[PDB]
Amino acid sequence: IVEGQDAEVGLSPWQVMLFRKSPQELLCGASLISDRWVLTAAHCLLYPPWDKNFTVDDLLVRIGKHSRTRYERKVEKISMLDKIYIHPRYNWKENLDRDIALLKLKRPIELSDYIHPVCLPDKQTAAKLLHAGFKGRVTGWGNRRETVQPSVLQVVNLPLVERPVCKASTRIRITDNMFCAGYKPGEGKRGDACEGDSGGPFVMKSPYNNRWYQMGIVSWGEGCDRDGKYGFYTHVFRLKKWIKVID
Amino acid sequence: CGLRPLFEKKQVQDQTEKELFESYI
Ligand SMILES: Cc1cc(NS(=O)(=O)c2ccccc2)cc(OCCNc2cc[nH+]cc2)c1
Numbered sequence: 001i002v003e004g005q006d007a008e009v010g011l012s013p014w015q016v017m018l019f020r021k022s023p024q025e026l027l028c029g030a031s032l033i034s035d036r037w038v039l040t041a042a043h044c045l046l047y048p049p050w051d052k053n054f055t056v057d058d059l060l061v062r063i064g065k066h067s068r069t070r071y072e073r074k075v076e077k078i079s080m081l082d083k084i085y086i087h088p089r090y091n092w093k094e095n096l097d098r099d100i101a102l103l104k105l106k107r108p109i110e111l112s113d114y115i116h117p118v119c120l121p122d123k124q125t126a127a128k129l130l131h132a133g134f135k136g137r138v139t140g141w142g143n144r145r146e147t148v149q150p151s152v153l154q155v156v157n158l159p160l161v162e163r164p165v166c167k168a169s170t171r172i173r174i175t176d177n178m179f180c181a182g183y184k185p186g187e188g189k190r191g192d193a194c195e196g197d198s199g200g201p202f203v204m205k206s207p208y209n210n211r212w213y214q215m216g217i218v219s220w221g222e223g224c225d226r227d228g229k230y231g232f233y234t235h236v237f238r239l240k241k242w243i244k245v246i247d
Numbered sequence: 248c249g250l251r252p253l254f255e256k257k258q259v260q261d262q263t264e265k266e267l268f269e270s271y272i
Pocket residue numbers: 043047092094095096172192193194195196197198218219220221222223224225230231232
């Protein structure tokens with residue numbers, strides 16, 4: 001996270017970190033959307049151009065953490081995947097369209113004060129909260145700048161940018177299954193996700209029911225916190241109908 | 248879901264939560 005702050009303990013109960021079993025290595029962020037289902041970005045598992053094609057036997061999950069390094073005994077919960085699901089129409093050889101993947105835990109995790117699911121958006125919520133100007137929250141243990149690994153979970157609130165601006169800022173073909181967020185050149189503030197933040201959640205709090213909803217998944221970005229450049233997020237609500245896999 | 252045990256359930260607002268609501272206005 002670029003221009004972030006250390007999060008308070010228990011800020012993001014749904015935060016999940018995708019790990020490489022051997023050698024231990026942090027690969028991505030992810031979110032706990034149920035006691036047995038973790039949501040992440042497909043590019044965290046499959047992206048041929050970089051030689052990525054992770055199998056269940058290569059991955060591992062660590063939930064309830066705060067420190068990037070320290071193994072927090074009894075707060076933290078390590079688990080292994082059962083099956084990985086990557087969207088059938090995930091376009092990796094073009095614009096990363098449908099950058100979404102579901103990870104099914106082998107054994108149901110035990111919720112606690114540090115482990116709790118996030119809500120998925122519904123029509124009403126998506127309609128009321130998805131508006132340019134409205135700020136959302138991104139969290140992760142990724143680089144603090146273009147590589148800086150944070151010792152503690154970072155957090156940053158970023159505003160939703162209007163589509164015309166998102167499209168104009170890049171050459172990549174933006175689809176409706178993705179949106180961008182970040183401060184504009186004149187907005188006088190900075191911040192953005194970065195390497196290691198991919199897969200992490202972008203959440204918004206609903207004043208209607210006091211509940212946090214995941215509106216997007218940290219997807220691609222051309223650099224970290226670059227002027228005129230915005231970070232892209234997988235549009236969760238538009239892909240909720242696929243999220244079919246769970247049933 | 249979305250109700251954090253150490254925050255929403257404790258009726259405690261997190262440090263930056265204010266920014267989000269302000270942006271809605
Ligand atoms: C797999 C992947 C490809 C690209 N390269 S890219 O030129 O931006 C790109 C864009 C879309 C399709 C293909 C390549 C970049 C990636 O982003 C990983 C970090 N995500 C970020 C999100 C927001 N800010 C900074 C980084 C991950």
